[PDB]
Amino acid sequence: RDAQRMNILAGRIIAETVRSTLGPKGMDKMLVDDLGDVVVTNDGVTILREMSVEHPAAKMLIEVAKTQEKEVGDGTTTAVVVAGELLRKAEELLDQNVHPTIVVKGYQAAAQKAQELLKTIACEVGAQDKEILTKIAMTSITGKGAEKAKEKLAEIIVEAVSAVVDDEGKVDKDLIKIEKKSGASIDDTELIKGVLVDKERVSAQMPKKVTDAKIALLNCAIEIKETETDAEIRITDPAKLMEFIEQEEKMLKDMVAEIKASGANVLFCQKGIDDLAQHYLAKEGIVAARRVKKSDMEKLAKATGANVITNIKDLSAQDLGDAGLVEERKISGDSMIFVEECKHPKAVTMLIRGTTEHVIEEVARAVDDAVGVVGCTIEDGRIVSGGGSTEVELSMKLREYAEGISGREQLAVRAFADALEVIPRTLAENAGLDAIEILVKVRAAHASNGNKCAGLNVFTGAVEDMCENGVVEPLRVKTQAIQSAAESTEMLLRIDDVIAAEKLR
């Protein structure tokens, strides 16, 4: 057989698994492999990476899906769930002797037509009105499941992205670091100007507070030095045992002398430190940490101005860093080092605590997406009321435009319009209310001169004003998802040649 239907049907099976996960209180499945590791997550990207595929034509949809994950993060499920509807409606078109080429031309024309529509519906907002940045945050956090400490978590994120606003009006997501650590509860979240180092000093005799501390970036294991060649040192006489081991320690004082004379105050070693070396740095009063992974040496260098140094026998003052305060307090038992710079805080760090390891993990995945969804708005300054209301408005005006196009092309244009009403349908069944009935009332609000912010509320269950409640999203999550759906639908309608090759490289 031609096996042409097996391609369009292969993608629908993958959409049903994710269609049920779309929504605030949407359930999830668990397709664990033959290993035994059980795990559940309310995210469409976590299942695709683990879900297996049997046919080779079920991979292009996963590759394109990962593109939006590294740009906005949220909104990938809305593109794969809607694409499956175009394939289902396409089956009805093939019955009427319609070639796929005529269907592809309708999506490309309808997709581009929806671009200019979203630009006119989007309103303008300010670049500093904090009141506008508060509603956009909770709109995405409440959907993930965090009805405990949301009124305060949104204020810790909006204040962090607003402080890292460069002169060109841009925001970066790498400068914001996250650290997970179980503690008292989630309310312990607090904003910090500097960066934290989850380590404890090896001596409580260090200065409690120091102003204008010069960072000394170290990149050498503070241990006994040995020749690279195969040649050990045999000790025998009771007198020769205090030379080969003592002379090596004298080099540390000579090394610290050059570092101390340059105005140094602290130090951070990438590797561990010898047990005997911890006694001299304590009795003499020298601040220094042990084991600093590469992930930390980078942020601590560019932030404080320090540069990477390979040779320690020439650490001049120009190579040292710069900071404002270096305090190390104890909380919840363990302690942490602080490295702030009030002169020019070019980076920030937000610590998160929790009671169980599962809580700190879920909340850690939302802080990285919340800073991205709001970053695009600060740079663009345009938002559109979401809540399943943007697609409802397109299903009313696009129908009138179909009358202009004549011939056998208007069939494909209308097929794309009636396929967008599936998003609010899933939200209806998730709340336990009928869909075909409520869809008759939602259209009454958008009759003609009615408001353009009417949407369904899963909480109350009645049509209300989505603008006053706090349901709003940017304009890039919609145009990108709709554009990605049309760009991926052609991969199933244009393909046809499927020869069983061998060793194609």
Q: Which amino acid is at 460?
A: T
On the CB side of 358, how many CA atoms lie within 13 Å of its CA?
A: 6
Three-class DSSP labels, 469-502: HCCCEECHHHHHHHHHHHHHHHHHHCCCCCCCCC
Q: Which is nearest to 475 in space by CA: 15, 125, 176, 131?
A: 125
Q: Which is nearest to 145 in space by CA: 15, 14, 28, 17?
A: 28
77 is catalytic: yes
Three-class DSSP labels, 33-67: CCCCCCCCCCCHHHHHHHCCCCCCCCCHHHHHHHH
Task: Dig out the tokens for 383 from the structure.
Answer: 């938002």
Element containing residue 153 per DSSP (H, E)? helix 153-163
Q: Which amino acid is at 223?
A: E
426 is catalytic: no
Q: Round to whole Å and give the CA distance between 470 and 136.
A: 7
Q: Which amino acid is at 249?
A: E
Element containing residue 350 per DSSP (H, E)? strand 348-352
- The per-residue b/e assignment along 117-137, b for 16 or more CB within 10 angstroms, e otherwise, is bbeebbeebeeeeeebbbbbb
Vertex 489, ends 486 and 492: CA angle to 5°?
A: 160
Q: Which is nearest to 40 in space by CA: 264, 299, 358, 265?
A: 358
Q: What is the CATH number of the domain that holds 239?
A: 3.50.7.10
Kindly list the distances between the CA atom of residue 414 and the CA atoms of 47, 51, 87, 99, 400, in Å, as whole numbers in the listed order.
Answer: 33, 34, 14, 16, 10
**Contact between residue 474 and residue 140 where contact means Cβ atoms under 8 Å apart:** no
List helix spans (H) across 421-475: 422-431, 438-445, 466-469
**Contact between residue 269 and residue 290 where contact means Cβ atoms under 8 Å apart:** yes
Q: Round to whole Å and give the CA distance between 322 and 215.
A: 6
Three-state SS at 85: helix
Point out the catalytic residue in the list 21, 74, 76, 304.
76
**Contact between residue 214 and residue 317 where contact means Cβ atoms under 8 Å apart:** yes
Phi then psi dihedrals of residue 177, to 5 deg: -100, 155
Q: Round to whole Å and give the CA distance between 350 and 327.
A: 17
**Contact between residue 336 and residue 371 where contact means Cβ atoms under 8 Å apart:** no
Vertex 360, ends 358 and 366: CA angle to 5°?
A: 105
**Contact between residue 159 and residue 378 where contact means Cβ atoms under 8 Å apart:** no
Q: Round to whole Å and give the CA distance between 185 and 206.
A: 30
Three-state SS at 235: coil
Entry field: residues in the chain: 505
- Burial class of 316 by CB neighbour count within 10 A (0 to 12, 13 to 18, 19+): exposed
Vertex 456, ends 452 and 459: CA angle to 5°?
A: 135
Q: Which residues contact 289 (CB under 8 A, 6 or more apart)?
A: 197, 199, 201, 267, 268, 269, 337
369 is catalytic: yes
Strands 176-180, 348-352: pairing is: parallel
**Contact between residue 375 and residue 362 where contact means Cβ atoms under 8 Å apart:** no
Q: End-to-end CA distance of the chain, in Å?
A: 27
Task: Dig out the tokens for 501 from the structure.
Answer: 């090759």
Instruction: Give the CA radius of gyration of the chain.
Output: 30
**Contact between residue 268 and residue 215 where contact means Cβ atoms under 8 Å apart:** yes
Point out the catalytic residue in the list 296, 304, 369, 489.
369
Kindly list the distances between the CA atom of residue 363 and the CA atoms of 45, 137, 435, 468, in Å, as whole numbers in the listed order.
Answer: 16, 14, 32, 26
**Contact between residue 367 and residue 158 where contact means Cβ atoms under 8 Å apart:** no
Q: Round to whole Å and give the CA distance between 4 and 325.
A: 67
Task: Dig out the tokens for 244 from the structure.
Answer: 């080969």
**Contact between residue 486 and residue 107 where contact means Cβ atoms under 8 Å apart:** yes
Element containing residue 298 per DSSP (H, E)? helix 294-304
Q: Round to whole Å and give the CA distance between 127 and 377.
A: 8
Point out the catalytic residue in the list 21, 77, 189, 390.
77
Which structural domain range is residue 299 located in?
Answer: 209-350
Q: Which amino acid is at 175?
A: L
Q: Which residues contact 432 (CB under 8 A, 6 or more apart)?
A: none
Q: Which residues contact 252 (CB under 8 A, 6 or more apart)?
A: 222, 277, 280
Q: What is the resolution of this structure in A?
A: 4.4
76 is catalytic: yes
Phi then psi dihedrals of residue 188, to 5 deg: -75, 0
Vertex 383, ends 149 and 477: CA angle to 5°?
A: 85
